[PDB]
């Protein structure tokens, strides 16, 4: 019995191109779940969040700001509608679009400000910051706009997956890496 | 065989409200177009025929849980009251609305006064609700 | 005749503390464990597994320390560290009778030859005789051991009905089952005792424990016969049902002695900076061709007597 997210999206065909992030993007096999709501204790120990499914990590990061704290059912519904919109707009697997968006949004070099010095970025922090940037871009696009949060999230994910500069996450990653290069 | 618990409750409430309105023997107060349903509401109900919906909901609640009085109904239909710059609190529904709904349902003979207080469904009311549930299940299938 | 490893049973989740077999059902055995369960094994002897867990008996609150099977093979009797004995109907796997009265861990249980009596030894330094209905017929505490009663056994020869007990006071005691009164007292051992077993004929009693020496006693004569040397602590002693052998679980290994020659026949060593798993219990098959051994790695190992 193959497990599909929301009963619609399969994980078998999802490919993670970047081998550095393959161990930190839990998307298939033992990490294929019907829903992005597990109520698991992923924060109990260090690195354990790497086992949290990437869709559920996105869902968790959507629970901002304060007024939306704890409304995980609402964020699950938002993610479901965003995946539907992504499938309509691109014809691709929304999981593949999300994986590509995260890969393209994760910054690879940063600056530590110890005058600043350039340092590398660990894969786990790459994934964390990619998710944070994607959610922040969607939220800021949806604020004070008739465009719904699901549509804004879908647009942000699609642009990040394409690598377009219309993406908030892509622009922020480019700025961070440019500053790191300057301080190198 | 279909009973109420077998169907979607929102669809059941809509179907039962339509049935009550079509039967047209339910007594409706003269002030249904003026009042709001609780002190914590800000506006009157959007639906003009809110009385039939409320009666259907009350009958369904009595089916699920008999012996409920006006106080229990006002607890059921209570909600959050926003208090301007002060925090929000729970608030109860309109006792007159609950009482008139119960009395109208009694007039339809679907509801009778319970021995231990409050109201309950008559066998006729139970039969009507089960038939409505069967219709809802047939429509879904 | 050298015994070879035939297979393993891997159901348990804790130390295998006791293994029981019955002549009626050659394909069914019982294994008690520290996971508070008793696994009834159905023996398939197939290529994949020698046997698989058929049923699990649950209801004990602490470690199950000892288990025996009734003569007809329909009921099982178990003791546990929760201080109670349980009687299990093997067909349904439910408890039919609870035996209460021991105030500490029950370390050993034993059925009589006709299954009309039950004997239990516990850490409360008391021996208890019960009937099948769960009533403590007698309690030996005055002349009993001054330390934990580690093992109690019944003589299979009805001609001289006696009970053999061993405890942590380094003593082997014999009790006249008729009156539950002391008859013989053996003062040979130098360390605490873990096990006493009785020969199928009832003539011999082998005792073993901390000192690593397996001492033989004549139940009829009431005198010490001889002593065999085991390298490690003796955890379990078992007489072969047909052959004139004595089997001892000495630490991680198993030693078989030919009582006629008083020499080692075979040494059963598991194939390996960690200490090896210890063998904790032994039980011969009904026909005497298969020896089941429990270990501290939660496994049961099957040894086949191969020509």
């Amino acid at each position: 019995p193959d497990i599909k997210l929301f009963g619609k999206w399969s994980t078998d065909d999802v490919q993670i191109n970047d081998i550095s992030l393959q161990d930190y993007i839990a998307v298939k096999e033992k990490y294929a779940k019907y829903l992005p709501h597990s109520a698991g204790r992923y924060a109990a120990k260090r690195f354990r969040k790497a086992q949290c499914p990437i869709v559920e990590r996105l869902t968790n990061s959507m629970m901002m700001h304060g007024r939306n704290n704890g409304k995980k059912l609402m964020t699950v519904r938002i993610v479901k509608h965003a995946f539907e919109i992504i499938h309509l707009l691109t014809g691709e697997n929304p999981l593949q679009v999300l994986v590509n968006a995260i890969i393209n949004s994760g910054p690879r070099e940063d600056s530590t400000r110890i005058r600043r010095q350039a340092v590398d970025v660990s894969p786990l922090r790459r994934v964390n910051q990619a998710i944070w940037l994607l959610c922040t871009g969607a939220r800021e696009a949806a604020f004070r706009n008739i465009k719904t949060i699901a549509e804004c999230l879908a647009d942000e994910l699609i642009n990040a997956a394409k690598g377009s500069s219309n993406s908030y996450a892509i622009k922020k990653k480019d700025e961070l890496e440019r500053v790191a290069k300057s301080n190198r | 065989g279909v009973t109420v618990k077998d169907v979607n409750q929102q669809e059941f409430v809509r179907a039962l409200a339509a049935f009550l309105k079509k039967s047209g023997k339910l007594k409706v107060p003269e002030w249904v177009d003026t009042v709001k349903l609780a002190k914590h509401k800000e506006l009157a109900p959007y639906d003009e025929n809110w009385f039939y919906t409320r009666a259907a909901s009350t009958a369904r609640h009595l089916y699920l849980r008999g012996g409920a009085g006006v106080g229990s109904m006002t607890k059921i239909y209570g909600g959050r009251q926003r208090n301007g710059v002060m925090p929000s609190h729970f608030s109860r529904g309109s006792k007159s609305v609950a009482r008139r709904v119960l009395q109208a349902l009694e007039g339809l003979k679907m509801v009778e006064k319970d021995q231990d207080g409050g109201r309950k469904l008559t066998p006729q009311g139970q039969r009507d609700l089960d038939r409505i549930a069967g219709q809802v299940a047939a429509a879904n299938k | 005749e050298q015994m070879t490893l035939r297979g393993t049973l891997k159901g348990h989740n804790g130390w295998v503390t006791q293994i029981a077999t019955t002549p009626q059902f050659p394909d069914m055995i019982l294994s008690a464990s520290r996971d508070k369960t008793i696994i009834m094994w159905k023996l398939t002897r197939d290529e994949t597994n020698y046997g698989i867990p058929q049923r699990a008996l649950r209801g004990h609150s602490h470690f199950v320390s000892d288990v025996v099977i009734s003569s007809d093979g329909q009921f099982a009797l178990s003791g546990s560290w929760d201080g109670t004995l349980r009687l299990w109907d093997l067909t349904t796997g439910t408890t039919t009778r609870r035996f209460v009265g021991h105030t500490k861990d029950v370390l050993s249980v034993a059925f009589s030859s006709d299954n009309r009596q039950i004997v239990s030894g516990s850490r409360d330094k008391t021996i208890k005789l019960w009937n099948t209905l769960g009533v403590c017929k007698y309690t030996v505490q005055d002349e009993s051991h001054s330390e934990w009663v580690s093992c109690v056994r019944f003589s299979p020869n009805s001609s001289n009905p006696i009970i053999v007990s061993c405890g942590w006071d380094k003593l082997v005691k014999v009790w006249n089952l008729a009156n539950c009164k002391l008859k013989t007292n053996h003062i040979g051992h130098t360390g605490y005792l873990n096990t006493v077993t009785v020969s199928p004929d009832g003539s011999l009693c082998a005792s073993g424990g901390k000192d690593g020496q397996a001492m033989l006693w004549d139940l009829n004569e009431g005198k010490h016969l001889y002593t065999l040397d085991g390298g490690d602590i003796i955890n379990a002693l078992c007489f072969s049902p047909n052959r004139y052998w004595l089997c001892a679980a000495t630490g991680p290994s198993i030693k078989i002695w030919d009582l006629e020659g008083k020499i080692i026949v075979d040494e059963l060593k598991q194939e390996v900076k960690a200490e090896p798993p210890q063998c904790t219990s032994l039980a011969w098959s009904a026909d005497g061709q298969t020896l089941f051994a429990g270990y501290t790695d939660n496994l049961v190992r099957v040894w086949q007597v191969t020509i």
Binding site: - | - | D105, R123, W148, W168, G191, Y192, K210, I233
Partner: protein
């Protein structure tokens, strides 16, 4: 941290020095022996003492130990 205090360590050393022949590498048997041969007011303290006794018994089997004179 899991550092055992002097109460636990000294009780374990005295128990080993006085009842070495009854102790072994099994925590549960050691715990039963400790509760039989000593008055330890609390179950948690008994468990800590028995655990350190087991650890020291493993060390003693592996070689001599300065604190304990058997």
């Amino acid at each position: 941290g899991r550092v055992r205090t002097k109460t636990v360590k000294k009780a374990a050393r005295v128990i080993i020095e006085k009842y070495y022949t009854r102790l072994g590498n099994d925590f549960h048997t050691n715990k039963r022996v400790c509760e039989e041969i000593a008055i330890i007011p609390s179950k948690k303290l008994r468990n800590k003492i028995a655990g350190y006794v087991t650890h020291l018994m493993k060390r003693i089997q592996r070689g001599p130990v300065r604190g304990i004179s058997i």
